Amino acid sequence: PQAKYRHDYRAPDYQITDIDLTFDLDAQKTVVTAVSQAVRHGASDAPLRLNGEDLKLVSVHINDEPWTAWKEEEGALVISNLPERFTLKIINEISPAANTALEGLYQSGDALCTQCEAEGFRHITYYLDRPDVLARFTTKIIADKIKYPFLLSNGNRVAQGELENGRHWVQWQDPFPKPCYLFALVAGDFDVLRDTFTTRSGREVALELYVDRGNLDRAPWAMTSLKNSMKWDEERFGLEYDLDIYMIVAVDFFNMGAMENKGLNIFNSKYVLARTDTATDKDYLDIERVIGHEYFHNWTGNRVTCRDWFQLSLKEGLTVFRDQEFSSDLGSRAVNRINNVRTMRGLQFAEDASPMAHPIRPDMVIEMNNFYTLTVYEKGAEVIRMIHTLLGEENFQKGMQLYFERHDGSAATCDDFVQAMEDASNVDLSHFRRWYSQSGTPIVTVKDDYNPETEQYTLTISQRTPATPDQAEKQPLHIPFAIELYDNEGKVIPLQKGGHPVNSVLNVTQAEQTFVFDNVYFQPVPALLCEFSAPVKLEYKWSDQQLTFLMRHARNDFSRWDAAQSLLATYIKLNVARHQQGQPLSLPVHVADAFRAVLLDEKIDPALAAEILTLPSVNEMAELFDIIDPIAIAEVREALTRTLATELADELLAIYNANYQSEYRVEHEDIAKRTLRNACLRFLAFGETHLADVLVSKQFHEANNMTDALAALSAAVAAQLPCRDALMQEYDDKWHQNGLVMDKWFILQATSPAANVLETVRGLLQHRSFTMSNPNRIRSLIGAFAGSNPAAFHAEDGSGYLFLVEMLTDLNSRNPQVASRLIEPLIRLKRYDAKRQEKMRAALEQLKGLENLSGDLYEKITKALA
Ligand SMILES: NC(=[NH2+])NCCC[C@H](N)C(=O)O
Ligand code: NA
Ligand code: NA
Ligand SMILES: [Zn+2]
């Protein structure tokens, strides 16, 4: 498979302006007729090169003339000797039922549906399958009326008809030019939730959510979130929906999360379907996020699209930033920022240290589906948020307005967006652009000095980014570095120098620099990198008392949580070293007292308390170490939980009881109290056994919602409580017919600390609720084992690696995108000890030798083995 490079971008030799599609739909054999109006922009002797994959070509006409000047090559139809303007007609066949990869036109249960991003439209017809080619689409769909009573494509219905032999047809027209990755088609039988939204300016939009028959009871929250998203985009960004109808289709078979096809979003059902007995608080908030996300793409992705796929973060970074701002505005900003920071430090930093490291705008891609990454999305959003930090809200919105004014109706680049922000705000972002082209996490080192004679506080800040596998050369970045200084009473000391205020966002642009502040009337406790103001590792020599002081006094709730994380990091590192020596947990009394104080603080927001009382995950803990010892980390996390459970037992029980709620509400105050109560339950589960067992069993049985039932079930599994097997069997007996609910249970099985977890996981491949045909099931069992049970995945006998090899040998052929998600834990081998590295390397070498190795796996395996 061949790598493509960003620097090789060239404008296309041909454009297509209009395409008229006809689908004669059938699961075994679909006939596609595509009539394209094309224009040659290049040299009269340049051929038209159409992308196409697994298509059976029936005919090629140019202006109704059967065409003889063409050839098929690997992945292409190359058409020669064309006039400057012409009509291209292609007829071809495809086979939706054979499409197990779920890219192009495929089958999801009884439905037919599409996934075209990034390069799936070439699996439907021969096309200029590249996002700088925008065209106006019409789509005629002909199908069996009984099997496919709903026939949907982008835009508005403009025609419809009945045919003989029980067939019917519908034709759709979308007035906005689009790249073909935004094309969608859906055919099937559905329940439809219908509602309306009236925009600020008075446009009435029909909202339609299509769900499998029988699921209308699980649709209203997604509909509510859609209306919430539309309203928010109006209030916050001044953006209105631009069509007459908004369709969402929930499908059970879907590779990723959801897809922003214009006017016809297609969603993994996990991000649509929710009822209080099936879905947790986190499911409701994820539905809200993803619904908003795809909606936000209407402007940031659709009205302005991507010139080429190396510009992916132009839409994904910006849209993730928007979904975070949406969630943060509607809910707890602090909890959102905290959770997004966990994801950055715990998952994205790991990617930026891995063989798959890339800048947010990549330079080299073999398989573009490999670049839908934590980096492109989450780090891309941190880069957008840094622009917001540098510019302020008002200048940021002016930049947004200039971006749309310049680029509406076109395909743009990351550079175009930065340029708009810079021009609108008059903030110079020339140095800042390096964030787009440089991979790896910067390390920011801070030294400080207080001078009592001059009342001056001096910060010496240095930065470096270590070399990554993809880039030998690194340079200093423009790092917005937000600080606060606290006096002995917990009050903020005004920042100033030479009689003038100083902005609290420091511009750290050099390898090393010194910031001096005057009138610093007391030796400060600093809050550094406030609200995680740049996506960097902070090296500062904190004392425990500085951190507990910030926990108590810091102005922003995020800083209080972050201080608790820095406090814990020291002791996680200590205790992992001790575990390796065979020693038990050591924890100063004053550290345990810090957490007791949070439990007993009556003024603290319970949402904040809950996060401080949620220990860093084994993934967040892993990024504290150069060499990861996954067994030590898992055992230390447990022991730290047991120690705090013992030390805080009475307080934990009191707070658990105090936060009891009889009514279930998906409302932020209620969610916060419930999150705190279940955080207390998790510690209690690891306390005295009989009490743990009674508490956990009682909560499982008395829960009037899935959040509380699952929190109890999960604690029963984590703490290996007596009641575990019973509750697990009850849940299976109740829920086996519901795949999305069973995904929770498969995750609990996959992440079990039990000695025999791999044996149980292998057996579950035969479970009534599991199937290798379904990406959600695969990810919930196998993915959760490899990715979220690193202790068992990295069992010293190499059994975890061998299991994953077996699964990937199947999935390489069945669904390479899902296989490529699942290989990720194996490509981290250089983070592990030599003995584990040699086994993981052997596993990778075995996969490399697969007959018909997918480009998806090839790209990752070769980087990992280099
Ligand atoms: N199979 C894929 N590569 N899917 C990518 C679709 C992601 C979609 N644009 C989103 O932001 O959610
Ligand atoms: Na808020
Ligand atoms: Na110092
Ligand atoms: Zn997106």
Domain endpoint, select from 408, 439, 470: 439
Residue 234: helix, strand or coil by DSSP?
helix
Q: Cα 824 vs. chain centroid, distance in angstroms?
A: 15
Yes or no: say if 633 and 703 are a contact pair by the CB < 8 Å rule: no
Residue with tokens 């209030």: 235
Nearest atom within ligand 1 for CA of residue 258 = 12
CA–CA gap between residue 255 and residue 827 (Å, rounded)? 21
Yes or no: say if 188 and 148 are a contact pair by the CB < 8 Å rule: yes
Beta strand 537-539 pairing with 443-451:
parallel
Torsions phi, psi for 229 (to 5 deg): -65, -40
Question: Which ligand is nearest the CA of 297, by number?
Answer: 4
Q: Which tokens hold the place of 386?
A: 């840094």
How far away, in angstroms, is 657 Cα from ligand 2 center? 27
Q: Quick check: is 1 in a domain?
A: no
Q: Cα 62 vs. chain centroid, distance in angstroms?
A: 43
CA–CA gap between residue 558 and residue 483 (Å, rounded)? 13
User: Using what technique was this structure determined?
Assistant: X-ray
* E strand or H helix that includes residue 208: strand 204-211
Length of the chain, in residues? 866
CA–CA gap between residue 623 and residue 616 (Å, rounded)? 11
Give every CB contact of residue 406 below 8 A, 6+ residues apart in sequence. 412, 416, 420
Q: Cα 651 vs. chain centroid, distance in angstroms?
A: 36
Q: Which tokens hold the place of 463?
A: 């930065």
Q: Quick check: is 76 in a domain?
A: yes
Yes or no: say if 480 and 505 are a contact pair by the CB < 8 Å rule: yes
What CATH number has the domain bearing residue 614?
A: 1.25.50.10
| Helix, strand, coil share (%) of the chain residues, nearest 5 | 45, 20, 35
The half-sphere exposure of 146 on its side-chain side, counting CA atoms within 13 A, is 3
CA–CA gap between residue 564 and residue 572 (Å, rounded)? 12
Strand partners, 207: 195, 246
Active site residues: 294
Give every CB contact of residue 430 below 8 A, 6+ residues apart in sequence. 422
How far away, in angstroms, is 451 Cα from ligand 3 center? 10
Question: Which ligand is nearest the CA of 300, by number?
Answer: 4
Q: Cα 82 vs. chain centroid, distance in angstroms?
A: 44
Q: Cα 853 vs. chain centroid, distance in angstroms?
A: 26
* Residue 621: domain span: 542-866
DSSP per-residue string spanning 382-425 = HHHHHHHHHHHHHHHHHHHHHHHHHHTTEEE-HHHHHHHHHHHH
Q: Quick check: is 2 in a domain?
A: no
Yes or no: say if 400 and 412 are a contact pair by the CB < 8 Å rule: no
* Identity of the residue numbered 664: Y
CA–CA gap between residue 320 and residue 373 (Å, rounded)? 12
CA–CA gap between residue 520 and residue 524 (Å, rounded)? 8
Strand partners, 194: 208
Domain endpoint, select from 541, 575, 605: 541
- Calculated CA dihedral for residues 682, 683, 688, 692, nearest 10 degrees: -20
Residues flagged as binding site for substrate: 117, 257-261
Report DSSP state, residue 262.
T
Torsions phi, psi for 586 (to 5 deg): -120, 130
Answer yes or no: do 719 and 653 share one domain. yes
Q: Could you tell me if residue 72 is left (phi over 0), alpha (psi between -120 and 50 degrees) or otherwise beta? A: beta
Torsions phi, psi for 725 (to 5 deg): -60, -40
Report DSSP state, residue 589.
H
What CATH number has the domain bearing residue 530?
A: 2.60.40.1840
Q: Which tokens hold the place of 19?
A: 């395409």
What CATH number has the domain bearing residue 314?
A: 1.10.390.10
Question: Which ligand is nearest the CA of 236, by number?
Answer: 2
Beta strand 76-79 pairing with 48-51:
antiparallel
How far away, in angstroms, is 218 Cα from ligand 2 center? 26
Residue 63: how many other CB atoms lie within 10 Å: 12
Beta strand 505-508 pairing with 479-486:
antiparallel
Q: Which tokens hold the place of 31?
A: 């006939």
Q: Which tokens hold the place of 727?
A: 């509750």
CA–CA gap between residue 409 and residue 136 (Å, rounded)? 11
CA–CA gap between residue 312 and residue 417 (Å, rounded)? 12
Residues flagged as binding site for Zn(2+): 293, 297, 316
Residues flagged as binding site: 117, 257-261, 293, 297, 316
Ligand 1 test: best mutation among 103, 294, 372, most atoms within 8 Å of CB? 372
Q: Cα 201 vs. chain centroid, distance in angstroms?
A: 33
Nearest atom within ligand 1 for CA of residue 369 = 3
Answer yes or no: do 447 and 435 share one domain. no
Helix 724-735 to helix 706-718 angle (10° resolution) is 140
Domain endpoint, select from 165, 190, 215: 190
What CATH number has the domain bearing residue 76?
A: 2.60.40.1730
CA–CA gap between residue 861 and residue 843 (Å, rounded)? 10
Residue 41: how many other CB atoms lie within 10 Å: 11
- Total structural domains in the chain? 5
Yes or no: say if 60 and 89 are a contact pair by the CB < 8 Å rule: yes
Yes or no: say if 636 and 616 are a contact pair by the CB < 8 Å rule: no
Nearest atom within ligand 1 for CA of residue 255 = 1
CA–CA gap between residue 857 and residue 92 (Å, rounded)? 29
Q: Cis peptide leading into 279, omega within 30 of 0?
A: no
Q: Quick check: is 4 in a domain?
A: no
Query: Residues with beta carbon < 5 A to ion ligand 4?
Result: 316, 319
DSSP per-residue string spanning 438-489 = --S--EEEEEEEEETTTTEEEEEEEEE---BTTBS------EEEEEEEE-TT
CA–CA gap between residue 647 and residue 594 (Å, rounded)? 12
Q: Quick check: is 509 in a domain?
A: yes
Q: Could you tell me if residue 212 is left (phi over 0), alpha (psi between -120 and 50 degrees) or otherwise beta? A: beta
Yes or no: say if 311 and 179 are a contact pair by the CB < 8 Å rule: no
Ligand 1: residues with CB < 6 A are 115, 117-118, 255-260, 316, 369, 372, 817
Answer yes or no: do 797 and 682 share one domain. yes
CA–CA gap between residue 230 and residue 295 (Å, rounded)? 7
Please choose, from the candidates 333, 364, 416, 380, the residue with its C-alpha nearest in 3D space to the C-alpha of residue 672.
Answer: 333
Q: Whose CA is nearest to atom 3 of ligand 1?
A: 369
Give every CB contact of residue 242 below 8 A, 6+ residues apart in sequence. 176, 298, 303
CA–CA gap between residue 550 and residue 527 (Å, rounded)? 7
Q: What is the resolution of this structure in A?
A: 2.0
Answer yes or no: do 324 and 469 share one domain. no
Answer yes or no: do 175 and 141 share one domain. yes
Ligand 1 test: best mutation among 256, 270, 298, 316, most atoms within 8 Å of CB? 256
Question: Which ligand is nearest the CA of 460, by number?
Answer: 3
Burial class (CB in 10 A: 0-12, 13-18, 19+), 7: exposed
Residue 491: helix, strand or coil by DSSP?
coil
Q: Quick check: is 856 in a domain?
A: yes
Please choose, from the candidates 677, 685, 703, 593, the residue with its C-alpha nearest in 3D space to the C-alpha of residue 642.
Answer: 685
Please choose, from the candidates 516, 427, 517, the residue with its C-alpha nearest in 3D space to the C-alpha of residue 478.
Answer: 427
Q: Is the dihedral of CA 314, 317, 321, 323 positive or negative?
A: positive
Burial class (CB in 10 A: 0-12, 13-18, 19+), 197: buried
DSSP per-residue string spanning 91-144 = EEEE-GGG--S--EEEEETTEEEEE-TTTTGGGTSSB--STT--EEEEEEEEEE
Q: Quick check: is 571 in a domain?
A: yes
Answer yes or no: do 313 and 366 share one domain. yes
CA–CA gap between residue 815 and residue 828 (Å, rounded)? 22
Alpha-helical regions (H) of 157-311: 220-232, 281-296
Burial class (CB in 10 A: 0-12, 13-18, 19+), 757: buried
Yes or no: say if 340 and 790 are a contact pair by the CB < 8 Å rule: no
Yes or no: say if 277 and 168 are a contact pair by the CB < 8 Å rule: no
Q: Could you tell me if residue 795 is left (phi over 0), alpha (psi between -120 and 50 degrees) or otherwise beta? A: beta
Order the strands of the 537-539 sheet from edge to edge. Answer: 512-517, 456-464, 443-451, 537-539
Answer yes or no: do 496 and 630 share one domain. no
Give every CB contact of residue 591 below 8 A, 6+ residues apart in sequence. 544, 567, 571
Answer yes or no: do 531 and 552 share one domain. no
Q: Is the dihedral of CA 616, 617, 620, 625 positive or negative?
A: positive
Helix 312-330 to helix 333-343 angle (10° resolution) is 140
- Write down the number of H helices and E strands in the chain: 29, 33
Burial class (CB in 10 A: 0-12, 13-18, 19+), 61: middle
Q: Please list every residue in the chain followed by a chain break, i.e. its C lies more than 2.5 Å from the next written N.
A: none
Report DSSP state, residue 331.
S
Answer yes or no: do 529 and 678 share one domain. no
Yes or no: say if 829 and 864 are a contact pair by the CB < 8 Å rule: yes
* Identity of the residue numbered 719: A
How far away, in angstroms, is 458 Cα from ligand 3 center? 9
Q: Which tokens hold the place of 178?
A: 């689009």
Burial class (CB in 10 A: 0-12, 13-18, 19+), 814: middle
Yes or no: say if 164 and 396 are a contact pair by the CB < 8 Å rule: no
How far away, in angstroms, is 860 Cα from ligand 4 center? 23
SS3 sequence of 517-552? ECCCCCCCEEEECCCCCCCCEEECCCCHHHHHHHHH
Cα-Cα end-to-end distance for the chain: 16
What radius of gyration, in Å, describes the C-alpha atoms of the chain?
A: 28
Answer yes or no: do 69 and 145 share one domain. yes
CA–CA gap between residue 692 and residue 686 (Å, rounded)? 7
Ligand 1 test: best mutation among 103, 113, 116, 117, most atoms within 8 Å of CB? 117
Report DSSP state, residue 235.
I
Residue 258: helix, strand or coil by DSSP?
strand
Q: Quick check: is 88 in a domain?
A: yes
Q: Which tokens hold the place of 173?
A: 């027209």
Order the strands of the 76-79 sheet from edge to edge. Answer: 48-51, 76-79, 70-73
Answer yes or no: do 448 and 356 share one domain. no
Answer yes or no: do 285 and 174 share one domain. no
Helix 799-814 to helix 757-764 angle (10° resolution) is 20
